Swiss-Prot record, chain A:
Belongs to the universal ribosomal protein uL3 family. This is Large ribosomal subunit protein uL3. Keywords: Methylation, Ribonucleoprotein, Ribosomal protein, RNA-binding, rRNA-binding. The gene is rplC. It holds the Pfam family Ribosomal_L3.
UniProtKB/Swiss-Prot annotation, chain B:
It comes from the Bacteria. Belongs to the universal ribosomal protein uL14 family. The gene is rplN. GO terms for cellular component: cytoplasm; cytosol; cytosolic large ribosomal subunit. The keyword RNA-binding applies. One of its GO terms (molecular function) is large ribosomal subunit rRNA binding. This is Large ribosomal subunit protein uL14. Binds to 23S rRNA. Forms part of two intersubunit bridges in the 70S ribosome. It holds the Pfam family Ribosomal_L14. The keyword rRNA-binding applies. Changing residue 114 to A: Reduced RsfS binding. Part of the 50S ribosomal subunit. Forms a cluster with proteins L3 and L19. Forms two bridges to the 30S subunit in the 70S ribosome, contacting the 16S rRNA. In pre-50S ribosomal subunits interacts with RsfS, which may inhibit association with the 30S subunit.
Swiss-Prot record, chain C:
InterPro entries: Ribosomal_uL6-like, Ribosomal_uL6-like_a/b-dom_sf, Ribosomal_uL6_a/b-dom, Ribosomal_uL6_bac-type, Ribosomal_uL6_CS. GO terms for molecular function: large ribosomal subunit rRNA binding; structural constituent of ribosome. The modification N6-acetyllysine is found at residue 43. Belongs to the universal ribosomal protein uL6 family. Part of the 50S ribosomal subunit. This is Large ribosomal subunit protein uL6. One of its GO terms (cellular component) is cytosolic large ribosomal subunit. PROSITE patterns: RIBOSOMAL_L6_1.
From Swiss-Prot, chain D:
Disulfide bonds: none annotated. This is Large ribosomal subunit protein bL36A. Keywords: Ribonucleoprotein, Ribosomal protein, RNA-binding, rRNA-binding. One of the last ribosomal proteins to be assembled in the 50S subunit, it contacts a number of helices in the 23S rRNA, acting as molecular glue. The simultaneous presence of uL16 and bL36 probably triggers ObgE's GTPase activity and eventual dissociation from the mature 50S ribosomal subunit. One of its GO terms (cellular component) is cytosolic large ribosomal subunit. InterPro entries: Ribosomal_bL36, Ribosomal_bL36_sp. GO terms for molecular function: rRNA binding; structural constituent of ribosome. Part of the 50S ribosomal subunit. GO terms for biological process: cytoplasmic translation; translation. Belongs to the bacterial ribosomal protein bL36 family. It comes from the Bacteria.
Amino acid sequence: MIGLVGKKVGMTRIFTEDGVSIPVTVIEVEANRVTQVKDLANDGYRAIQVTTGAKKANRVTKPEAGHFAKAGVEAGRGLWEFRLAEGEEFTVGQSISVELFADVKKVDVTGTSKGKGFAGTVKRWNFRTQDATHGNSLSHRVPGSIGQNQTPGKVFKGKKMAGQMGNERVTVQSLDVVRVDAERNLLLVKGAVPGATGSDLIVKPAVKA
Amino acid sequence: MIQEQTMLNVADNSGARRVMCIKVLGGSHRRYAGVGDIIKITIKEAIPRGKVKKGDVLKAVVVRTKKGVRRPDGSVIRFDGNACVLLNNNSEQPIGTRIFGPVTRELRSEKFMKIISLAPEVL
Amino acid sequence: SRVAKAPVVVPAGVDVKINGQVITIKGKNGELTRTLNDAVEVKHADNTLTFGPRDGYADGWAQAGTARALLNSMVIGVTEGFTKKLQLVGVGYRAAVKGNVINLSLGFSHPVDHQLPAGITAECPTQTEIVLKGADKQVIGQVAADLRAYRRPEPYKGKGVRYADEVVRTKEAKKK
Amino acid sequence: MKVRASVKKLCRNCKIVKRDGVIRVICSAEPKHKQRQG
RNA sequence: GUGAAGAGGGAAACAACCCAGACCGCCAGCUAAGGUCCCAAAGUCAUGGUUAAGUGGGAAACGAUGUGGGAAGGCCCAGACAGCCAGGAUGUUGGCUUAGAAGCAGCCAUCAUUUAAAGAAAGCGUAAUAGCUCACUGGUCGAGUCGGCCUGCGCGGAAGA
RNA sequence: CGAUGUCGGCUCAUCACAUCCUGGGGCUGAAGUAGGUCCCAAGGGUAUGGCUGUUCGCCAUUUAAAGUGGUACGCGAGCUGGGUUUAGAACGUCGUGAGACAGUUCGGUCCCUAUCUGCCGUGGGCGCUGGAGAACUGAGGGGGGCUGCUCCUAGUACGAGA
RNA sequence: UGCUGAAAGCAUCUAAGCACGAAACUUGCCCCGAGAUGAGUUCUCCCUGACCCUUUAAGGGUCCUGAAGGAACGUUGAAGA
Ligand SMILES: [Mg+2]
Ligand SMILES: [Mg+2]
Ligand SMILES: [Mg+2]
Ligand SMILES: [Mg+2]
Ligand SMILES: [Mg+2]
Ligand SMILES: [Mg+2]
Ligand SMILES: [Mg+2]
Ligand SMILES: [Mg+2]
Ligand SMILES: [Mg+2]
Ligand SMILES: [Mg+2]
Ligand SMILES: [Mg+2]
Ligand SMILES: [Mg+2]
Ligand SMILES: [Mg+2]
Ligand SMILES: [Mg+2]
Ligand SMILES: [Mg+2]
Ligand SMILES: [Mg+2]
Ligand SMILES: [Mg+2]
Ligand SMILES: [Mg+2]
Ligand SMILES: [Mg+2]
Ligand SMILES: [Mg+2]
Ligand SMILES: [Mg+2]
Ligand SMILES: [Mg+2]
Ligand SMILES: [Mg+2]
Ligand SMILES: [Mg+2]
Ligand SMILES: [Zn+2]
C-alpha cells in the first residue's frame, strides 16, 4: 500500500477512559497531490510521485514549475515517490488524504533525525570512558586502542570512531496508529518518531506485524 | 533501583533489620531491581532471637524504593527509603509472618498475595 | 541386466506410447508418463517391452534395468494399481479422510491435516487404519512415508504411525 | 552414528554402501553398527 | 658443485637448485633447461590408453562391492550364486551346577538315532519353559557365480586464525 | 644490540573453530524430566564480586552460557605503572671484605604539535559529450541477527510412583 | 531422514529419477548507494547574430550576446568545526 508525506508537529498525550496515558507524536498530513504516475512501459517500474504543502512562487524554479504545470497541480514543498502494488492505481492530479490510514493498525515513520554535530565515540557509539582518576593522563573520553599490532598493520574499515551523528534518515517501525482525522489533517501515532518539530515525515503502513 | 552493595531496610518480622543486596536476580548483567523484583541478600544486622541471623545469605523481594513506581497515566509513587521482605532461598516465599509499612499493587502476583494481605496499606 | 533383459508383457487393455525417451502407459486405472535416461534404448514389439543399453554410455545396462523395473510397475499401476496400508498405535491416535485430506489425530496440540497429491486416494476402514491407493508406485510410497513421519514408531511401546506390514522392535528402559 | 577412519561390518546384517562418495555401514539388526567413514 | 666474486633463460616471486659463463653493436638465424588454451612467445598437434577425484593442484597407519589391465582356482544344466516355498526331528529338560539353567549364565562332554537334512546349537528371546531365526536339506528358478593373487589410476582418513 | 619498551589491568577490538549457550541431527547402558557421546553449525550471545600485581586459580552469588585458541603470548607515538633490571634502606642467607640472592621487605621521573599508509567524518574539482533543475532505478556496500521465565495445550503423552 | 531403483534376479537414500532437512548461505527488515568511468532511467527548463586569420580542423581568435540555472551579498536554522 502507498504511504503519505507529512510534517512532525510535536508530541502530546491521549488519556483513555480507564487511566492509560498514550504518548503520541502529532503528524500533520495534508492532502498529497499526485504529480506523476510511473508505469512499466515508460519508467520500468510502477509508482506515484506526490507533492504536499505549498511553495513560494519566487522560490519555484522554472524546471520545477513546468513539472507541476504538467500535472495540473500547484507547487508543493517537495516531491516523494511511493511504490505501487499490483492493483494499486492512481491518476495524475489526484488528491490522497490521511484517511488512507483509517484502518491501518500500525505504521512505519521515517524522518531526518536531529543533528548532534561532530560526536565523540562515547556518545556516538556508547564507548565506555577510561578512568577519571587513578593516574589517567589526558585519556578519559578518548577511544582507546584502534587496532592490533604489525599484523594487520592497519585499521579496519567500519572501525567505530568519532564523526557526524544524526541528521540522517531513520525509520522507526510498527508504531500504533492512535487516531486519523482528515478534517484536521491529523495522524496520531503512539510513541516518538525521528526528527525535529517542523521537519518532513514519510508515513507508510507497517511492513511488519 | 537497587544494585549490589545497596542497603535496604526490612518490611517484616523476620528479625532482620539491615540487609545488603549481593545480587540482582533475573538475568545476565542485570543492573537494578525495583518493586516486585527478587534480590539475593546478606544480613548485616538482625535482632537477638529472630528467624534469621547476621551473615545469613538469602533472597528478598523489593517492596519500596526511592526511585518509585510509574503508573499507566504517568504518575509516580516514591518512598523515603528502600525496603524488602525476606524470602526462603528455595521456595521464595516469605520468612516473616507480618508486614510493615505501605506496599504497592505491583506485588499482586500469585507469589506475593500474602504480602499485600498483611500490609497495613496498599498503594 | 538380469532385470533389463527380462521383457515386460504389456497386457490386453494397456496402451503403450513412445516418443524417443518419453514413455506413456495408459490403462483402465490411469495413465503414467516417464522420461527414460538417454543411455537406455527401449523397444516395443509383440505385446512386450524390452530394454537394452545404448552405444556410447558407460552405464547403459544399469540404466536399462532401472528403466525396465520402472516400466514394469507403471503397467502394474494402470492395471492392478498399488495399495499401501498404515496403522496407528497409541491411545487417542486416530485418523479420518474427507475428500482428499487425511485428518490425523496424533497426540499433538493441533490435529494434523495432510493433503493427498493427485493420483493418490485414501480410506480409513477404522479410526486407526489408512489405506492408500494409487497407480504411481513412487508417489504412493512417498505419501505413506510422509504420514508415517508425523509419528514414526518409537522403541518403547511401538507407538506411532506404522506400515501395516511393519516390524517394530521394542526395548526395555534403562534399569532404574 | 559412529564416525571414524576405519569402518567395517560388525555382524552379518551389516552392509557396506557408498553414498555420495562416503563409505557407510548400514545394519538392519543393530542401530549401534551404523557407521560413516570420516 | 654453485653463490661468495657471476649477469642472462627456467623454478610465479625466490644469492646458494636446473640450463648456461655477458669484449662492443644488429628490428638476422639455431638451440639448452623449461615450455606451446588465454594473461604470455610456441601444438586447442597426431596416435593408443587411464582418471571422474578439479585427483591433477599438501599429509600416514588404516578402512572400502570406485574403476582399468593380467595369470590362476572353487562351485555349477548330476541345476550352482541370489531370491522365494517347506522342513530344521528323536534319546533329551545330555551330565554337573542352580531357586531355575530345558541348544542359548557358567563348567564338562558333544555322542547316537530317524534322516533329504537338522549343531547336545549361530544370534534374539523367557524367572525357567514357550516363541523368532541360523547352520543344514528337498522344492522352485534357469546360467552363471564366489573371492584370494600380480598390477595401473582414483576414494575416505584431511581442523586454524 | 648507530634501541623492535617487559607481565597484568583499562579502553577498543578482529579472526579461527578443536562449539560454552541457543539451532539441526545419529547412537545411547535414551520410559518422561534430565543426561552421556559423536556429527552438522561461527548468525548472534557468552557474569559481577572476595583474596592476590597477578594472567591463572580457589571461593561467594548469578546466568541460556560464563567457550578454546590466533592477532609482536592483539592493543604504552591510546591510558595505567600494582609485578618486574638502576641509584636509598633493612631482614634472613653467603662472603674475611668490597659485595651477592633466580629470597623477602619499605621507597622510588612512563616524552613525542601525525608528513605517508590506514581508519572515521566532511568538503572542493573535474567527468558522465549542449547546458540545467528534480524525482528515481538498484549493481555494489554496510547494519541487524542474542535469549530467560510464566501460561494454555496438560497435570495430558510417559511413568509403579515421584 | 526417506521414496522409487538398477548396477548385483535379493538388498541398497543414488548410479538415472523423486520428497524432506538448521540461528550458518541467498532473500525478506534498516542505512548508504550511478565516480555502477559499465558514470543508467523518467519528468521539466533554457539558449535561434556576425567577422578575421593561419599550418583548414572536433583549429585559433574578435565583435555582439549572457538564458535556464548556479553562486554572491544580507537576515538566519532543533543544520554545522
Ligand atoms: Mg527525496
Ligand atoms: Mg544539531
Ligand atoms: Mg568504567
Ligand atoms: Mg605526565
Ligand atoms: Mg585528567
Ligand atoms: Mg603500539
Ligand atoms: Mg600489507
Ligand atoms: Mg546427502
Ligand atoms: Mg666478503
Ligand atoms: Mg623471472
Ligand atoms: Mg666471456
Ligand atoms: Mg600465444
Ligand atoms: Mg587442491
Ligand atoms: Mg538357491
Ligand atoms: Mg635505526
Ligand atoms: Mg566443526
Ligand atoms: Mg570418543
Ligand atoms: Mg562468534
Ligand atoms: Mg551452568
Ligand atoms: Mg602482548
Ligand atoms: Mg605516553
Ligand atoms: Mg623477583
Ligand atoms: Mg537488479
Ligand atoms: Mg543518491
Ligand atoms: Zn550389524
